[PDB]
Design an enzyme around this catalytic site. Sequence first.
Site, PDB file in Angstrom:
ATOM      1  N   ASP A   3       0.836  -1.183   0.000  1.00  0.00           N
ATOM      2  CA  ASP A   3       0.000   0.000   0.000  1.00  0.00           C
ATOM      3  C   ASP A   3       0.877   1.241   0.000  1.00  0.00           C
ATOM      4  OD1 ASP A   3      -2.999   0.650   0.342  1.00  0.00           O
ATOM      5  OD2 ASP A   3      -2.051   2.014   1.776  1.00  0.00           O
ATOM      6  N   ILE A   4       0.333   2.343  -0.505  1.00  0.00           N
ATOM      7  CA  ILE A   4       1.039   3.607  -0.468  1.00  0.00           C
ATOM      8  C   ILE A   4       0.668   4.346   0.807  1.00  0.00           C
ATOM      9  CG2 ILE A   4       1.607   5.723  -1.690  1.00  0.00           C
ATOM     10  CD1 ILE A   4       0.175   4.249  -4.179  1.00  0.00           C
TER      11      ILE A   4
ATOM     12  N   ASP B 283      -5.035   2.196  -4.313  1.00  0.00           N
ATOM     13  CA  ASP B 283      -3.626   2.368  -3.940  1.00  0.00           C
ATOM     14  C   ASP B 283      -3.012   1.076  -3.403  1.00  0.00           C
ATOM     15  OD1 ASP B 283      -4.861   2.272  -1.404  1.00  0.00           O
ATOM     16  OD2 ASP B 283      -3.328   3.569  -0.535  1.00  0.00           O
TER      17      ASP B 283
HETATM   18 MG   LIG Z   1      -2.928   4.015   1.206  1.00  0.00          MG
END
Ligand SMILES: [Mg+2]
Lengths: 189, 334, 190
Positions: free
Chosen positions: C21-22, C65
């Site tokens: 994940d970002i 994301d």
């Molecule tokens: Mg995120």
Amino acid sequence: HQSYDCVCVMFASIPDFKEFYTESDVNKEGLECLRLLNEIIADFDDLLSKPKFSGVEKIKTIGSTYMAATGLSAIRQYMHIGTMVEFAYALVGKLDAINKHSFNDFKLRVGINHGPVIAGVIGAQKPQYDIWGNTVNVASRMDSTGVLDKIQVTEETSLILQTLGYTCTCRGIINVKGKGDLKTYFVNT
Amino acid sequence: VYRATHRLLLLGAGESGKSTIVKQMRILHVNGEKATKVQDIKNNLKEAIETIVAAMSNLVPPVELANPENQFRVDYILSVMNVPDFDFPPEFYEHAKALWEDEGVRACYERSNEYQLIDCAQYFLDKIDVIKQDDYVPSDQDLLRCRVLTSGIFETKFQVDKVNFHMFDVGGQRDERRKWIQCFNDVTAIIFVVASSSYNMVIREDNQTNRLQEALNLFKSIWNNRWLRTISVILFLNKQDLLAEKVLAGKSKIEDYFPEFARYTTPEDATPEPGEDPRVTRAKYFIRDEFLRISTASGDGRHYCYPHFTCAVDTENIRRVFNDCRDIIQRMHL
Amino acid sequence: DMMFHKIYIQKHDNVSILFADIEGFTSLASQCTAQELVMTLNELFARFDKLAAENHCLRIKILGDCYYCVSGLPEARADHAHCCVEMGMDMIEAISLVREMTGVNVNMRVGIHSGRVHCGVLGLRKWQFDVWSNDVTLANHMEAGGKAGRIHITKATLSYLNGDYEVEPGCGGERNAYLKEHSIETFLIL
Ligand SMILES: [Mg+2]
Ligand SMILES: Nc1nc2c(ncn2[C@@H]2O[C@H](COP(=O)(O)OP(=O)(O)OP(O)(O)=S)[C@@H](O)[C@H]2O)c(=O)[nH]1
Ligand SMILES: C=C[C@@]1(C)CC(=O)[C@]2(O)[C@@]3(C)[C@@H](O)CCC(C)(C)[C@@H]3[C@H](O)[C@H](OC(C)=O)[C@@]2(C)O1
Ligand SMILES: [Cl-]
């Protein structure tokens, strides 16, 4: 990849499923479960053929959650949003019939937003089609903070459904991580 | 490889007789061990007696004892009803026996349909003296008559004449049915199990819905199931002994629950068991025909229905009928 | 095949499952334009999709994301734990340049578990090859209970690592309920 002005995104999960998923030697280590899921999804997919849902354009499924959107086929005015709801009611029709034969009680939990998106293909490898933007995020958050057997819409989305013969009760307020607190409505039956 | 086996699924309402059938398979076709099932029977005894006395006051009319001295025993019993790890001391048995003797207590056991009561009541209580002995070894018939409710799916392998048989057991109760789907694909055949005797009783799950109707509806659910269009269903009209007894007793009449019985006359193809009463024959077949009406009305010959009058607690009648079934399986499947 | 629709699913043991994940995806989504976001995202995941194939990781999906692949598919590989790890290694450095380039603080939150999966497709329409099992549910949660710019791995993903990377106490049970409630010993890579 091209932008849009008025696309109506919908999420419909089946939260009751994650519980029901088990991995025993008896059920081929969960294969018998994913089997029932498949039936459900397929039963939902069988709807898109219906002439009345020909504007409906399924995006993906995320786990046991159905993602679908109207008005990607574009360039009275918001008759497409009303279809989306019309479609969410149909998923409940199908999910209800699975129950009958699967001796189960799966409720569907829906969230329907609308507004600007950006559609197109992502990933170099297998290029798959998806949609982005804040409209989608909220659509999603309408589902997750949703209530079983109910469709949760935002305010404007509500106002429009009102212009089309839908009655809406206010749910209250929700922190949507990024946009903050916003008012939301359940669609009445 | 995979075709020389047969996957059988046991379906029916709660208490129908499904676990007893798998038991009979062990008794019939499988290979310290039982000392643990003694405790289980002790509870069957406990749960049974304490249920009969609790019912006495909450009945309409309520039932009095023919020996009011027994009140103190009644008192004893109710005081221990919810004790967690019950020590089962010598009193319990003396007291249980005592009550079981009380003609009043028995009278309430006659009205056992008006409240929820296990099927092993009159059987175990008739043998308290045997069970109480610290050197007690339960008979084969005792392990069959015991009751532990099914919770989950249970695979059971047996072999008859080098031919292989997989059997799956499942919760007959409503909360439990949601697991059945996990056996639906690949099923060689359904054995649907029905407490024929339970025609005068309501399900545990809501204390209102008639058990046999719940049975009929459940069958209709299965017969017309969407994933069971091909699969045939061998019907075990279980507990034929208990049925017979109720019919002859003439206490609770059938037509008073399923009023269409009033019309029913006995079929032509009827094969009555040697010197079985015309009334018991009439009764057992009405219940069969009840089930068949559902099976008749649909299927297209894409799947069929096979009735059997059965008594799961009777290894005699079970060998006979399960054999009647291998015949069916080996014709059809091949 | 006749009464149930044909299921295009197949069991696959001894695979490893990465999720990534970002971190600070909303702060990015706040700053730059509605469109440039989608281009800053599409660029990165096509950059990831190169790295995957070199590291013998079959990419599954992008879920907003969330990016997730799995090593050990389609045909089993005994490097399968090293690969998902190797895959994560790059993602934390592949974000690095497209982080400084935007002037906003973003990093990758990695989580890898190992075990059996099912993989295949669901439904009739719009197929998208996917993975489902508790090992996948766990994988997902490791990323959820991960540490910024670090690779979160399980008990089993060490048992398949053959002790080639230098780990440290993870403490996943304190960043995610799933891990705590299921008593998972978690680790971080150094
Ligand atoms: Mg995120
Ligand atoms: N008299 C008599 N009693 C029977 C017969 N078959 C079963 N029983 C009794 O019924 C009781 C419950 O049977 P059981 O087999 O456990 O029900 P079930 O269908 O398995 O219910 P569940 O296990 O799915 S919840 C047992 O105490 C057993 O003695 C029968 O043919 N005759
Ligand atoms: C379908 C069954 C089951 C149990 C199996 C599974 O691993 C999942 O599909 C994952 C984990 C898994 O497929 C990886 C992606 C994603 C999207 C994270 C899934 C969801 O969390 C699913 O549940 C939801 C919430 O849809 C979940 C958990 O559901
Ligand atoms: Cl029954």
